[PDB]
Design a binder for these strands. Structure first.
Lengths: 97, 89, 94, 102, 97, 102, 94, 89
DNA sequence: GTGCCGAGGCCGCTCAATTGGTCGTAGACAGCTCTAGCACCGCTTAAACGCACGTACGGATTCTCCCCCGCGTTTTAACCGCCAAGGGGATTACTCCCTAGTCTCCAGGCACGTGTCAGAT
DNA sequence: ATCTGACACGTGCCTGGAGACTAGGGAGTAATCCCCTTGGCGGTTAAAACGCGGGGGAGAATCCGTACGTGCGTTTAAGCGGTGCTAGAGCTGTCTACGACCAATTGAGCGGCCTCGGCAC
């Protein structure tokens, strides 16, 4: 969080961290809010990739597919109902930007 | 997957309301994970010296996951469905 | 005693009973699964997906739409306190 | 937000008070895909070289991340209002994370 | 918590509610703190008994044994390392008052 | 605490400051056994009439309740200290419960 | 090919391999359990309980006591940030 | 339970330190619950095609549950135990 | 009002689900034994409740500082379409490593009972 | 200094734990098809970063009522302990309801591909 961000590696843009706050309903945000928000996403992505890599490595593959992340997602006891299919991202979806 | 089961109930309950394909996949994913949490509850409450899941184990396992009003309305609906299966087999 | 079709039609259900039996047996949680337990789990899913579909259908009609979206599912679950206790740990729409 | 199809609520230097009302009406992710793919491959490159990431795996990785990030920021807003304050500070998010892992 | 206590049932004594705050390191306690404390202990015991009773019903017993509580503890995904054996109650044990 | 041969480590009446150090040194539970059995049978009477409770089950039931209650209050103390206050109130405990279940 | 000892003595482990295999096989997870998974699971338990016993013994020695108690085991856990994350959700006896 | 195995470890590390009987039961319950979490992690990480658990499944399961410095030292100890067992069969 | 792409409808194609038997097998039931949970009375006595005194503290108020929202400008990189090469995911077939199963043997850890010293007072 | 009763130690044993074929399945390897991933280029252009007044939120200082720490006594009930009773767990011994396995069959639900209408601007 406080020290999970490091110089030299790519991070979230500053404006997108403020968008994450507005989805939560916050009205006023401090100027030193980007550092904890960038830290938490970089921690959560590091947690998700590390679980997904070992599922891929144990299956002797080289590409992280949807089955590897799904085994990674519920290994942390986090139920996920937004499983993508081949029809994902149609008109307005949960996967678009 | 439970896609065709969910669509039939929507036709019975809301005849003028359809469902998106993306929304149907999320509902089916809820239905799959709902059966998984009940299945874990049925095994946990089952005694270690037993190797069969009876109908009574699923009854008590759903009562833990479903609190108060939902659990009370669940047990009446399960037993009515079971006794229909017992006399029509 | 008679058959007249599938198991779900025999128990007067719309969720497939034989599919819920595959959930119990291929889970690995137990060696043997009784036939009455498969029907009970089928009635478990059928009733509480009926509660979600009833609330999502009313939420979709209130917004002057005839198709249920993922937003109407999330609004229906959050507006019910008893339904939120079961699937509130799940991930909806990011 | 920048992809095709739909999912955008409002644009054009839209004000902050309107932003809370608009963001509760949209359903799309709010982190760019190219920056997230560069991020996702960079974490893997530190541990295992030459890892390909599926397009379906990228979408579901991003959905889990924002849903956990927004859930943390909603918990951070509660502590801010509990201290009779309206501005989310750095210490409120650190306290919110500490209350569940620590 | 707020309204989980009802008049007519035995509840946690007021001095025992204050001792719970002392073990948490609180130096000062409010006078209205006895109400959420009594609710939460009552809520957790209501949750623990309800899971344990249906574990007893399936095993066709009439006494709540230590195995029924243990299965109720692992059903909430809460690991418990305090297993009282026949040697419990010796000296400074964690199961004493 | 009142059980025979228990490590209570408290000597009669103590002040508030000395009670914190004394309770951090003891290991015994702080709810009496008789009133916990009375509560345990009373709630079980609402579901199944005439249910006996074993003494081994009562000890495991009380240990889970003590650890969950103290964990909530340690979380409730953090919200109090985050609001620049030194007095734990009823709102702080209800906020701590809401931040994990709700 | 060494018949002079047990599975734990062959792998030079103090944790019994046979009891660790019983936990793995009879967990209701999979039908087949290999021989190498039994030895590996016993070694993983053995190394990190050596970590707990090393910290508990140092905590007990610093308290001028020759017997490791429950409080010494508890006090060793939060003194290590890496060990506490594994068993932070566990009930450490009140 | 692992009462005798954990007592013999304490004699190897600290020869002049004993253990409470209640403390030994808690340490044994740590060993059972550590075995449950690793084994459940190994079942999860297996692909759907495979049905058995090899040594590589337990090795990667220990890396996920144990973070940073503990996870790296775990794989070194587990591999050295397997290779010693693989030469003294 | 109008573009538009997705749910609905329609065409095959399976293999999942179903019935019908045999086979063993696992839970229901009864009965005997006895560990243990409830109750209660005596008695103790540590402990909880209530009350008066007083001091620290959170709430209210005013004032001031500073930093963050709002708006304009500019740089810049995420994303369309559309392209292409190709790396590795499925898929199938062959080969063979090993592990559940069955039988046999045996000795090591666990309960029962007893000495004696680590620790609380 | 002085208990004490909990831990270390000695014994009986039987059920956990280990050894030796067996063979059948599942894991490993290799070739081949082609699906989906990386790279990128013209252009967009909406979003992101940057800069500049300006006001609202947070911090600091002061004051004070009232709610909580704290001795002191009174009051209530938790616990030893011992007792006795007996409701009900544990285990044994059928045996009959009932679930797994295997052979065969078919059509409900699967995918591929049009096509018009509901949601977005």
């Amino acid at each position: 969080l406080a020290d999970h961000v490091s110089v030299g590696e790519t991070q979230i843009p500053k404006a997108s961290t403020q968008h994450l706050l507005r989805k939560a309903g916050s009205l006023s945000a401090a100027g030193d809010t980007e550092v904890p928000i960038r830290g938490f996403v970089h921690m959560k992505l590091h947690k998700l990739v590390q679980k997904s890599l070992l599922a891929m490595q144990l299956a002797k593959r080289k590409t992280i597919m949807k089955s590897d992340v799904k085994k990674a997602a519920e290994l942390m006891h986090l139920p996920v109902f937004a499983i993508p299919t081949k029809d994902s991202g149609a008109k307005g979806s949960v996967f678009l930007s | 997957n439970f896609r065709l089961g969910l669509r039939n109930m929507l036709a019975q309950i809301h005849p003028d309301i359809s469902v998106q394909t993306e929304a149907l996949s999320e509902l089916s994913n809820i239905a799959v994970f709902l059966g998984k949490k009940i299945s874990h509850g049925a095994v946990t409450l089952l005694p270690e010296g037993t190797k069969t899941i009876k109908s009574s184990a699923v009854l008590l396992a759903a009562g833990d996951l479903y609190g108060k009003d939902l659990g009370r309305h669940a047990v009446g609906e399960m037993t009515k469905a079971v006794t229909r299966y017992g006399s029509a087999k | 005693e008679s058959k007249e079709g599938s198991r779900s039609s025999k128990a007067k259900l719309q969720i497939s009973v034989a599919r819920s039996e595959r959930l119990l047996r291929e889970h690995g949680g137990c060696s043997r699964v009784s036939e009455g337990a498969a029907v009970a789990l089928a009635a478990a899913i059928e009733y509480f997906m009926g509660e979600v579909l009833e609330l999502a259908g009313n939420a979709a009609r209130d917004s002057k739409k005839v198709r249920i979206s993922v937003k109407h599912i999330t609004l229906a679950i959050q507006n019910d306190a008893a339904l939120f206790a079961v699937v509130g740990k799940g991930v909806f729409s990011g | 937000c920048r992809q095709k199809g739909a999912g955008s609520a409002g644009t054009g230097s839209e004000t902050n008070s309107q932003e809370v009302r608009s963001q509760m009406r949209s359903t799309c992710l709010i982190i760019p895909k190219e920056r997230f793919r560069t991020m996702a491959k960079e974490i893997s490159k530190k541990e295992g070289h030459d890892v390909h990431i599926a397009e379906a795996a990228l979408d579901m990785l991003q959905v889990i991340v924002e849903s956990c990030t927004v859930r943390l920021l909603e918990k951070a807003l509660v502590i801010t209002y509990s201290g009779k304050r309206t501005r989310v500070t750095s210490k409120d998010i650190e306290t919110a994370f500490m209350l569940e892992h620590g």
